Amino acid sequence: ASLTEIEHLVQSVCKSYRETCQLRLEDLLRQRSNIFSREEVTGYQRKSMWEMWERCAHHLTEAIQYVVEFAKRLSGFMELCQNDQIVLLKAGAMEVVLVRMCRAYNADNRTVFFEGKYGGMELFRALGCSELISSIFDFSHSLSALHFSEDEIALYTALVLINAHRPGLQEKRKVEQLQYNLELAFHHHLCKTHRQSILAKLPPKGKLRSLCSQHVERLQIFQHLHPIVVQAAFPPLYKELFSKILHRLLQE
Numbered sequence: 669a670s671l672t673e674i675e676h677l678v679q680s681v682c683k684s685y686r687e688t689c690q691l692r693l694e695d696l697l698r699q700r701s702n703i704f705s706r707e708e709v710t711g712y713q714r715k716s717m718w719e720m721w722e723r724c725a726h727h728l729t730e731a732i733q734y735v736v737e738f739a740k741r742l743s744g745f746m747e748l749c750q751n752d753q754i755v756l757l758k759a760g761a762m763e764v765v766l767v768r769m770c771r772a773y774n775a776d777n778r779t780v781f782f783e784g785k786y787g788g789m790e791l792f793r794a795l796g797c798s799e800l801i802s803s804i805f806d807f808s809h810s811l812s813a814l815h816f817s818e819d820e821i822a823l824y825t826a827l828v829l830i831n832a833h834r835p836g837l838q839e840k841r842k843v844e845q846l847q848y849n850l851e852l853a854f855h856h857h858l859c860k861t862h863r864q865s866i867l868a869k870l871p872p873k874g875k876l877r878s879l880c881s882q883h884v885e886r887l888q889i890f891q892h893l894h895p896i897v898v899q900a901a902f903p904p905l906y907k908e909l910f911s912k913i914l915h916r917l918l919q920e
């Protein structure tokens with residue numbers, strides 16, 4: 669690739685990201701004072717474990733749908749084979765949502781935007797997965813310290829998705845080229861903006877993997893106690909990724 673081609677890739681990755689966010693960042697920043705009252709927090713804590721799990725799996729499904737759309741807009745992704753597109757979204761969709769999450773997090777009061785207002789960790793106490801919630805809030809807190817611009821999140825999340833080391837890849841070399849080009853775009857943009865200092869501070873790659881394993885372990889626990897809740901009231905896309913639908917979303 670040449671220099672005008674690296675810069676063109678930067679702009680298309682940033683444009684693809686802005687167009688595939690479930691929530692506008694302007695809306696998220698203007699809502700920061702709209703915080704759940706102690707009575708509203710108590711209502712969430714008093715909801716049944718299964719009711720909280722259904723709501724959260726539904727919110728994760730909506731966010732993963734926007735990540736599927738982001739992947740379809742990344743140059744090179746639809747040029748990969750269907751097996752590879754599916755391998756990458758199955759391994760990387762949750763990881764992308766985990767990074768995106770920091771836009772809806774407020775490190776000033778340790779709250780997250782959930783169902784119209786901001787609330788802390790204690791809002792998810794009914795889920796019965798305290799350590800997973802803690803890890804999610806800590807990971808968001810650690811990304812907030814980086815003060816990412818939207819362009820930085822866009823370039824980083826494209827790299828979280830386009831990972832050539834994913835087990836199951838048929839055309840490994842084609843994914844390596846796409847990843848190398850997105851790496852040049854990310855590093856070029858960081859070099860240009862005098863932001864290469866964030867490289868050393870980016871979360872290690874076993875951290876995203878650990879967060880994803882915790883999610884699948886806690887879901888197995890919930891599913892064992894409530895198998896009919898999962899079968900009857902969990903979204904089909906959630907069950908395909910974590911317990912088909914990807915083939916339809918990708919063709920569309």
Ligand SMILES: C[C@H]1C[C@H](C(=O)O)CC[C@H]1C(=O)N1CC[C@@]2(S(=O)(=O)c3ccc(F)cc3)c3ccc(C(F)(C(F)(F)F)C(F)(F)F)cc3CC[C@@H]12
Nearest residue numbers: 689690691724725727728731768769772780782801804883
């Ligand atoms: C804001 C939204 C839209 C943005 C955009 O695109 O604009 C991109 C980010 C996206 C987002 O942050 N999210 C999408 C849904 C949401 S959540 O908001 O429901 C929420 C629940 C629990 C929590 F700790 C914190 C938040 C979510 C849902 C369920 C789980 C579970 F693993 C867990 F942890 F609950 F167990 C699980 F297991 F339920 F799946 C984790 C998360 C973390 C990411 C969150």
